[PDB]
């Protein structure tokens with residue numbers, strides 16, 4: 625395999641971490657290839673669940689706890705910390721909240737969160753590499769509680785970063801937030817990519833095509849598929865009671881991605897940097913409720 629940049633995996637990985645049996649597990653947790661029967665049973669469906677009130681309470685709770693766990697990871701970000709160390713803390717923090725770390729064995733993903741450094745677009749696997757001054761790192765958290773998943777991510781600065789890193793991360797965040805600000809009933813899901821790409825391109829960045837935002841609730845990934853680029857053909861129209869993510873990945877160079885031999889780590893084909901933010905959203909009537917928002921502080925961690 626020819627790496628696209630400077631980053632390399634740092635093996636070996638620690639033995640997978642067990643989750644105590646008192647924590648409720650999603651279907652894929654014990655499937656030998658980590659396949660989710662319940663997702664496979666709706667594969668290729670465009671229909672979007674309208675959440676009951678009970679479903680809404682369930683999502684509020686899991687997304688709140690997911691934010692708490694992300695905040696834990698955010699407090700650990702500094703030079704010399706490894707991504708495995710971050711994942712270990714996340715793993716214990718999920719268990720402390722009586723939640724299952726959704727990534728763990730999802731289609732055999734080996735860890736409890738995703739750590740994506742520099743040219744990694746998403747789904748980086750926590751490993752023995754220590755964070756370096758000047759890196760940007762995304763941590764993606766997903767928790768499962770009482771049958772519901774809640775999903776968010778942020779990109780962080782490790783020490784001081786260069787102006788390009790600052791502008792990439794800020795623009796990405798603005799892309800997310802401009803998309804969220806358009807969410808309300810009657811808006812087509814395919815419109816969000818128009819908005820995101822417009823802002824990205826205005827600042828000289830590209831928008832990853834291969835990965836999309838998604839419905840989420842009882843399933844981790846389900847309808848709708850929510851592309852982040854312009855002139856996409858996503859199916860469906862927002863309605864009160866819909867729950868889904870928006871998670872744009874924006875890049876300094878070209879948009880094209882490829883995957884490491886591990887089967888997960890997605891990297892820019894050009895080796896330039898990519899950044900991401902993600903929220904889980906509920907469509908209401910005034911608009912939308914950001915289920916994964918911070919409750920105690922105005923801004924994402926990178927500003928703070």
Ligand SMILES: N[C@@H](c1ccccc1)P(=O)(O)O
Nearest residue numbers: 727730733764765766775871
């Ligand atoms: N949280 C994410 C995830 C976790 C684990 C495995 C695959 C994707 P994504 O849906 O945001 O890409």
Ligand SMILES: [Co+2]
Nearest residue numbers: 764775776902
């Ligand atoms: Co995520």
Ligand SMILES: [Co+2]
Nearest residue numbers: 775869871902
């Ligand atoms: Co997601």
Ligand SMILES: [K+]
Nearest residue numbers: 741742744898
């Ligand atoms: K990245």
